């Protein structure tokens, strides 16, 4: 199954997620089809908190990708 | 096997293996009847053996015992071999 | 849309199959001089047309045999 999920690579105690479209059998931080945005849960100051390529998201949810719970609520934060 | 599910999977493997073996042997037996009739040379005997063997092959391909491409290949080759008989 | 090569028939003794020599000019990486390299391709001619010494043109197909995946298109120079 193709999913859209968070790949955690940041620093210790300071996560930074890449929103990736991948096959769900791959490792969390391994091989993916396409990176579409990022999520920075802390994001102080002038840093971006959440960037989410919307046309790619729509294209992949059209091809049958299934977002996570987190990426669903984040795609709700965007476009809004 | 270490966990309970691994030994249940081994049990189910034994049962499925017996079932599948019966069905696969059946398909081979019907193809052999068709081929023995073909080697016999008669066209009526060959066509009746082929008419009996086609539904068994299609049935066992519907159940996944053999692949559908295998079924199509047998149905095509046995047919070409009974049409050459007469 | 296809991938074609050109060469010379160096053998034809095999049943409806030729051996063609494609010549290539590969540049040496360190010393920067183009040196001539060669490759022999077992190609397929079903009519037994090409004879040893012809200049022919081949194109990649699906495998016809073990080590034969090229098929003849035509003879350019019937030598």
């Amino acid at each position: 199954m193709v999913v859209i999920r968070l790949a955690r690579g940041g620093a210790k105690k300071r996560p930074f997620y890449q929103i990736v479209v991948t096959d769900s059998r791959n490792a969390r931080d391994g091989r993916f089809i396409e990176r579409i945005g990022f999520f920075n849960p802390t994001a102080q100051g002038q840093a971006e908190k959440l960037r989410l390529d919307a046309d790619r998201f729509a294209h992949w949810v059209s091809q049958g990708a299934q977002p996570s719970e987190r990426v669903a609520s984040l795609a709700a934060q965007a476009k809004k | 096997a270490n966990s309970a599910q691994a030994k249940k999977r081994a049990r189910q493997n034994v049962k499925a293996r017996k079932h599948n073996a019966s069905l696969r042997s059946m398909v081979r037996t019907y193809i052999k009847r068709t081929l023995s009739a073909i080697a016999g040379g008669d066209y009526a005997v060959a066509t009746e053996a082929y008419k009996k063997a086609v539904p068994v092959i299609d049935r066992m391909a519907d159940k996944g015992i053999i692949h559908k491409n295998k079924a199509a290949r047998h149905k095509s080759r046995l047919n070409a071999q009974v049409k050459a008989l007469a | 849309t296809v991938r074609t090569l050109t060469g010379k028939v160096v053998s034809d003794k095999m049943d409806k199959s030729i051996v063609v020599l494609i010549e290539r000019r590969v540049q040496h990486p360190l010393y920067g001089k183009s040196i001539r390299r060669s490759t022999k391709l077992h190609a397929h001619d079903e009519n037994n047309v090409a004879k040893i010494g012809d200049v022919v043109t081949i194109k990649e197909s699906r495998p016809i045999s073990k080590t034969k995946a090229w098929t003849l298109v035509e003879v350019v120079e019937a030598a």
């Binding site: - | - | 040496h28 010393y31 001089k33 040196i35």
Partner: protein
């Protein structure tokens, strides 16, 4: 020389050889010493050089040098040896590490104490 000559036959590298073959690319090596004796140096030098004859865990059997003034090695002592050859003793290509397993540190030392396994005096 010519370009064609270089493409045909390339340029050959002469791979070097290790000067410490008995260490087997290890930094140090544990040996058991079978012979503690003295040697005399080469042409212009004069001394009674304290040398050890160790069998290494790497299978070799080599002579190492005991540095510093005064040691306590015997036969069947377990020593650590390292690289570094002594110039006037031909064939001694290793040193014994002082302050290691059985080799104690040098006594009464106060300068370059790290190189002789001597602890800071208090």
């Amino acid at each position: 020389a010519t370009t064609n000559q270089l493409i045909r036959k390339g340029r050959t590298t002469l791979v070097e050889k290790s000067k410490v073959p008995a260490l087997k690319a290890c930094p140090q090596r544990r040996g058991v010493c079978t012979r503690v004796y003295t040697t005399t140096p080469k042409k212009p030098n004069s001394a009674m050089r304290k040398v050890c004859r160790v069998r290494l865990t790497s299978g070799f059997e080599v002579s190492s040098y005991i540095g510093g003034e005064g040691h306590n090695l015997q036969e069947h002592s377990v020593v650590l040896i390292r690289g570094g050859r002594v110039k006037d003793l031909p064939g001694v290509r290793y040193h014994t590490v002082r302050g290691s397993l059985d080799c104690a540190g040098v006594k009464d030392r106060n300068q370059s104490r790290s190189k002789y396994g001597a602890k800071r005096p208090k």
